[PDB]
Design a binder for this molecule. Structure first.
Ligand code: BEF
Ligand code: BEF
Ligand code: BEF
Ligand code: BEF
Ligand code: CA
Ligand code: CA
Ligand code: CA
Ligand code: CA
Ligand code: CA
Ligand code: CA
Ligand code: CA
Lengths: 515, 511
């Protein structure tokens, strides 16, 4: 049975005979029925690809018929073809998960379009994506080669992201491998770019992107100073650009995007440095000088982000803002639910700052790491898991609450993560699992890392003059020499951060108005 | 509140003045542009809610414009409004992720429809679903009351599942609690039904649903005997009917459903008993008798499902089948990947049996790992995480491989699981217990003082089984408060509920 089977329910089948003949010439098989009751029985006994429903029928309405049919077989698309132009009927139909609604008199080609849209869209998107990428990939490879500035890197990354999400679900493995290879080459070139240019960004009056320590003052404070709406400022820990893309469509049910500014995490691309920098408004070295009671170096025991509220309150004072402002750090579901359920207590704030931790992608427990790997083995899976997370997170409940109170939403992150593949040995560390190491006696493969023997020049502390930082490039992960083989097999294909990649370093900043 | 902003690109803006006036009366703000390139600039510098594109324009075509706009801001819906009736234009537009395509001359109300459908559908679905359930729930309560057979229980469960998935994205808490109360009432009645009928199902010539120990012979062997295609037989441990429902539409990309048979797990609704029964073709008591070298009772140490291949091979021999047949048990990602990558080795089998434990692992991890607790905090979340898992699982890769080799797919499970809520004291797994001198609340459990009557082993005449009903968990009187705190809202199985006991058996042909 090659031909598409349409069931068409309408009390006036006579009048539709032109459309039926037209569809039959175009190789559709139409079975007609002149009342809902019989249509339902037919629909139970046979396998239609699609149903067309009149609305105004003397027995059961189209929508009553649809409701019965959907209960039996909810995956079959249902199209309403009706003379009714009334808005309330439109709304009922839409609310009933109609796949389309065509107003009589209908152009027969409008029905054909609808059939293509509702039955062939998946195939046509795959084909079109596939052809378009076949024609595009060479131009992407060459654009990559010509990339010369941080802004070109942003534009190229945006291109890769766009194609990544489109090629997710195609089947051609050749095209998928071509893209994988472009991503590797992009990260190789980006690594060299950062290696060559990062230090110069700290010179006075340098051309540089917005970075962690600039973020609040350059992008958040203007929104505060508009004095238009209270602000919910959310930092999702460790979110990549593609993770944002994965739930863009969900958040749009509540919030309309007004502004999107890609910015660059500082190095290391890690919470202790970049996230504290967001809230302090200072590079780590300056946090060590100006706030020694809050700054902790890697060597010190305990939480590395305990004092973000204190940092943020001090920053807000230095910038001469007089606002009602609170900070929340959610590290678990329970915490998240409590804040969602109690969010209305903050109706009077100018600013609510929420740090919202994602899932731990790097467990030291094998069974937990097995769970993560089954859920997030590759980038597509990671996105899928992220989308599931966001739809069902207390974070989204917090956002809905904020929307109902007319808050503006600022959504951003401290840095992303990258799926690591290639091990690189490091000795001496005396530390966890990140794509940076710091210490006074490090040995390493210098080709694999960006090496900074003078940390203070990029705003990082140094215990003494032997302190160095190394930052992994590409998809390297830094592996300890002891138990090397087991380490490599464990941490291969995990989401790590701390180093240089488009994924880790170029991250979204987003401003939205409540819908 | 704030007006919807439309950007409309057409080289003949003059001729669209009626449509624009109509939309403006209906509170749309229209910005017009007569060529794609200027439209692109506008589209970069402003946040439009939606774009209308003509196709035939001098300069950039609609489709060229669309391509540029989607790259810049891919989440903004775009509608083509064009004189072009060409099929290839239709297909290109569709393939380019157009949200709609309206053929000129367009009824202005057709545009309005499109705007409502593409911008308001979430809200309209919520409202409509909510009112549909408000009008239906009384009829559901009545169907519940009229349930007198196992097949009626299957039909009613199907109805609850349908409404559960529909109500997952509504807001009204009253309506949500009404449904929760129908589920509780269904499980209370189902519990009594099972209590009253279960022993009698083992009487000769009893009218009874297919059960674990019948499953292979009654439902798998007829498929083997058609001798048409090899069979991939997948047992996903611990799959609830609603989890099947959550990924039905994914499977359908590869496999067409031929037959669905809901069946009943035996008691306890637990792997050691019900899963072994599937593979052995025997009740646990008979497994203890006929295969004491494989059967393990609860007290014995070590894995309780180590010998399923051997049980299955023996069953196949008893039923007089001569087939090439292998069994695989996937306990991790690595194992799953290996099997997907090397599946073609099994092209020559009549039967491949794959047990996949991951969903079982999730259900316990919801309590233990903070990752999964954040991801699977309620039933909606659990389904969502299951669907994300399935779409990106090695299991689905195995299924795709099987499809490419023309295998028939049989998909089933051993039992489901239920979110436990209410504690029930016992002193001597939390939905069944076995032992000789047990205290319990008889109202909360199904009590079997003679295990042999329901095909279960018995240490002594004193030894009995109790099976939790409803959403009870069996809690020890010592450390009761800590017990209750810890186990409330965890996934458990082993007892009686629709979730635990009525489970899918599914047969599909490769597409
Ligand atoms: F009588 Be109808 F809804 F065209
Ligand atoms: F900007 Be494009 F469609 F090459
Ligand atoms: F010039 Be068109 F495609 F209406
Ligand atoms: F496979 Be189980 F822990 F009943
Ligand atoms: Ca009619
Ligand atoms: Ca972080
Ligand atoms: Ca030095
Ligand atoms: Ca034109
Ligand atoms: Ca271009
Ligand atoms: Ca099981
Ligand atoms: Ca279990």
């Amino acid at each position: 049975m090659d031909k598409i089977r349409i069931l068409w329910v309408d009390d006036e089948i006579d009048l539709l005979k032109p459309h039926i003949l037209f569809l039959e010439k175009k190789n559709y098989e139409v079975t007609t029925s002149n009342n809902g009751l019989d249509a339902i029985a037919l629909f139970e006994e046979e396998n239609f690809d699609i149903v067309f429903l009149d609305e105004n029928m003397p027995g059961m309405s189209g929508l009553e018929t649809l409701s019965e049919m959907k209960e039996k077989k909810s995956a079959i698309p249902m199209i309403m073809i009706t003379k009714s132009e009334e808005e309330y009927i439109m709304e009922e139909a839409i609310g009933s998960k109609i796949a389309d609604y065509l107003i009589k008199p209908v152009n027969p080609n409008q029905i054909l379009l609808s059939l293509k849209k509702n039955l062939d869209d998946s195939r046509l998107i795959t084909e079109k994506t596939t052809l378009d990428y076949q024609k595009e990939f060479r131009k992407i490879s060459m654009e990559l080669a010509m990339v010369n500035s941080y802004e070109d890197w942003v534009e190229l990354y945006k291109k890769l992201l766009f194609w990544e999400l489109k090629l997710e679900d195609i089947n051609d493995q050749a095209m998928i491998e071509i893209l994988e290879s472009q991503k590797v080459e992009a990260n190789s070139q980006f690594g060299k770019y950062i290696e060559r240019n990062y230090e110069d960004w700290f010179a006075p009056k340098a051309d540089k992107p917005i970075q962690s320590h600039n973020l609040f003052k350059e992008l958040v404070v203007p929104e505060i100073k508009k004095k238009d709406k209270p602000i919910l400022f959310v930092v999702i820990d460790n979110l990549r650009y593609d993770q944002w893309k994965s739930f863009e469509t969900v958040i749009s049910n509540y919030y309309k995007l007004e502004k999107e500014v890609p910015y660059f995490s500082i190095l290391p691309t890690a919470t202790q440095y970049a996230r504290n920098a967001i809230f302090s408004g200072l590079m780590p070295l300056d946090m060590e000088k100006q706030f020694p009671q809050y700054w902790k170096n890697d060597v010190e025991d305990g939480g590395k982000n305990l004092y973000e509220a204190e940092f943020l309150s001090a920053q807000i004072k230095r910038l001469g803002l007089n606002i009602k402002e609170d900070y929340f750090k959610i590290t678990n579901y329970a915490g998240g639910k409590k804040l969602a359920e109690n969010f209305k207590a903050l109706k009077g704030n100018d600013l609510v700052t929420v740090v919202y931790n994602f899932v731990d992608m790097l467990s030291h427990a094998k069974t937990e790491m097995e769970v993560v790997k089954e859920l997030a083995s590759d980038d597509k899976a990671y996105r899928s898991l992220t989308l599931s997370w966001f739809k069902n997170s207390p974070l989204l409940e917090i956002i809905q609450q904020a929307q109902l109170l007319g808050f503006k939403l600022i959504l951003t992150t401290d840095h992303g993560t990258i799926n690591v593949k290639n091990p690189s040995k490091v000795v001496g560390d005396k530390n966890l699992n990140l794509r940076y190491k710091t210490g006074r006696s490090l040995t390493y493969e210098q080709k694999d890392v960006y090496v900074v023997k003078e940390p203070k020049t990029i705003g990082l502390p140094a215990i003494n003059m032997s302190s160095s930082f190394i930052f992994a490039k590409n998809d390297f992960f830094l592996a300890y020499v002891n138990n090397y083989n087991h380490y490599v097999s464990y941490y291969k294909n995990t989401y790590q951060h701390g180093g240089i990649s488009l994924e880790e370093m170029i991250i979204p900043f987003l401003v939205f108005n409540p819908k």
